[PDB]
Design a protein around this ligand. Structure first.
Ligand SMILES: CC1=C/C(=N\Cc2c(COP(=O)(O)O)cnc(C)c2O)C(=O)O1
Ligand SMILES: CC1=C/C(=N\Cc2c(COP(=O)(O)O)cnc(C)c2O)C(=O)O1
Lengths: 408, 408
């Protein structure tokens, strides 16, 4: 049952090195995660033994590669509990998945008077495609407001969503506040108003179980690179009845059935939405990442991260002059600022002690404006991090504070 | 100077195995190429040592990954002799690159009366995005006709292209006929009529030197998986003055400069066209494939493939009852049919002898209709193939012919 962190860290070769003469402390898994040998050796065995293009009815290596690629599609369907492989589309990442929904669903289903509803805590990937789609259609964009601790109340959702709302798009978990939003209840409110709900699951999928039947979301998007898998690949899930009626976002080989000089017809789902040679190795590697995380247990990973987040919030409250943003109940990250030290300089001095964090707006400029700052620092955690690494981070922040005070 | 094929094959681990009790003979590099250890160990060193998300001004591993990703962009610029890294955009593959030109350039620059000119030998990736763009704009699609040996004459180009033509899109090399089209002279004809030229370089880039300044093409697209590099990545080259005036195809983080609630502004080139976390490992691996092919020499690879194609065409002319399609002067592939044996069954029986070829329409249904067949078989070559492998293929075709005659 209970995960052993020593034995998990032993499977990630990149953790065992020094930076600037200190052991690496990597606390930037919300920007990207590190990979275990089970995934890296999956990519190696594919390119060393059975790489070939994918299709029905070809030679021996081509059949092995096709069985690998469509095998990985079934592992994804089981991992988020979708009803069918026709609802699982491989893309290059969360951002491309949400752009496909805005191009193929929203640009076809919006007209003047219609509304798209989003929230002030959304990442840019779940803001800009909607700004562009309402511009193209003459519709209206509206924002749900936040409570003072950076949570959403269902009363404010009901107030913002109306019978003119056609789409509500919302993060499952914020990559800055750590808030877990009440998606299942928000889906009920959208459906009761006649709208669909589009969920950005880039920060939830790596760190907690997803069940799209229980959430009842109409679309759900995620990225491999945040959940121990290769870069350059992601998924778009959509309910089959909505994908059946959407046109493709891109056109070419593999997604057609018949091509004449002027007109063509498309393949059935899910291939209708996969044009060209697919991301073969990366999707097979994402299937190996899923197998790896399922063998550990997503509920075990969630419980470890609950322990690390509770420990970090307590230890941050021990520091004078430090502000943390967002709620007490949260996922495994802390975004903060020191009084009087710019967050870029915090991240500079921490990297000189071996500690990797990120500073900036975290692709959420409207949220930074809501918080009344121009930038923040963020430490974010995953299954290979430990309480001793959080002690290193809070000791380094104390020394940073004393350093800049001495400078001034 | 002169390539040693023994020493090149020793670097591709996948070539050294048996299929169905016979040494593998892989003759399907136009569908995808195999990779050398220099590229596979590039991906391993990235995930074992320096994976992190990319950006200016971050921690030590993030700086190494950013220097790797933008380093690979400069290797691509030098490899096709573009003037600037602002003209080199990383995408998921040729098909996505041509869809970006059709969405962001053609849908903005076509109106009724305007024409897009293509050719009957084009792959579907360079047909369907134009069918869709002329549909959206009310413009007209026109085809340049072919000569009887599957070449294009510059007189027919001048006849088809007019002062109402705005875009000419054409393959550099056909993945079925093996024809090398006269792109530099076609670009002159397009420009003299007021049009831009879009070149599909998926089959030329792996196998011959590309110089986009000498070709004077306005856009050029290519795929990593055909040129010894990872799956899931490709390039779109465009002249800087045309990209500056095109809007992005996808929207999100990394491609913005300022994001307000309703309106945003974009980053400079090339990042304006790269939304979200990039294909970090795959682009670094494509840079290693470029370094590998440059150390061998693309002119040396082209000369090897000229020798293999001349040898194969002679040996095919020794077989009774076999038709080869396309011209005598050609790239390194042969597409053919046996009289009275369906090409699917040819590829079935060849794979039982260890030999991998492909049968079907090769994503070029209008060309198969021009050729008056419904499908063909294709053997295609690259730097690791040899004359002995072509002998195996022609001996297996003789035995296939005798087999089916005996059956009947
Ligand atoms: C460098 C960086 C990207 C980050 N976010 C990825 C992301 C994305 C974009 O995913 P991507 O297309 O894989 O970059 C969308 N929504 C949420 C909630 C995200 O966390 C981040 O937090 O730090
Ligand atoms: C399975 C298969 C794909 C093939 N073609 C890739 C290709 C493509 C599409 O490139 P992709 O997006 O990498 O699949 C466009 N133009 C030409 C001339 C091509 O050769 C092929 O010949 O066999």
């Amino acid at each position: 049952g209970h995960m052993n962190i020593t034995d998990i860290r032993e499977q990630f070769p990149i953790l065992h090195q020094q930076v600037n003469g200190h052991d690496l402390v990597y606390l930037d898994s919300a920007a990207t995660s590190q990979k275990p040998r089970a995934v890296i050796e999956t990519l190696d065995k594919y390119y060393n033994q059975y790489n070939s293009n994918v299709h029905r009815g070809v030679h021996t290596l081509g059949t092995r590669a096709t069985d690998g690629y469509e095998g990985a599609r079934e592992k994804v369907r089981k991992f988020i509990n979708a009803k069918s492989m026709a609802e699982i589309i491989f893309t290059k990442g969360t951002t491309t998945s949400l752009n496909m929904v805005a191009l193929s669903y929203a640009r076809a289903n919006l007209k003047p008077g219609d509304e798209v509803v989003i929230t002030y805590m959304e990442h840019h990937a779940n803001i800009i495609p909607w700004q562009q789609a309402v511009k193209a259609t003459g519709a209206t964009l509206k924002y749900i407001p936040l409570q003072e601790d950076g949570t959403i109340s269902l009363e404010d959702v009901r107030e913002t969503v109306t019978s003119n709302t056609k789409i509500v798009a919302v993060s499952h978990v914020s990559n800055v506040l750590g808030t877990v939003n009440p998606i299942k209840e928000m889906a009920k409110i959208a459906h009761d108003n006649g709208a669909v709900i589009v969920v950005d699951g880039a920060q939830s999928t790596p760190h907690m179980k997803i069940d799209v039947q229980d959430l009842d979301c109409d679309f759900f998007a995620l990225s491999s690179h945040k959940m121990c898998g290769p870069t350059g690949v992601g998924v778009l899930y959509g309910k089959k009845a909505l994908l059946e009626n959407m046109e493709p976002a891109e056109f070419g080989g593999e997604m057609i059935d018949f091509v004449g000089l002027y007109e063509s017809t498309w393949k059935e789902l899910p291939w209708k939405f996969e044009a060209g040679t697919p991301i073969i190795a990366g999707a097979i590697g994402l299937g190996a990442a899923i197998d790896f995380l399922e063998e550990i247990g997503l509920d075990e990973i969630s419980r470890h991260e609950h322990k690390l987040a509770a420990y970090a919030l307590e230890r941050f409250r021990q520091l004078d002059g430090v502000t943390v943003y967002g709620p007490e109940e949260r996922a495994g990250l802390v975004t903060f600022n020191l009084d009087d030290v710019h967050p870029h300089d915090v991240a500079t001095v921490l990297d000189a002690e071996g500690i990797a964090v990120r500073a900036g707006h975290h692709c959420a400029q409207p949220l930074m404006k809501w918080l009344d700052v121009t930038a923040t620092a963020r430490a974010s955690f995953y299954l290979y991090n430990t309480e001793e690494e959080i002690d290193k981070l809070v000791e380094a922040l104390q020394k940073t504070k004393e350093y800049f005070t001495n400078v001034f």
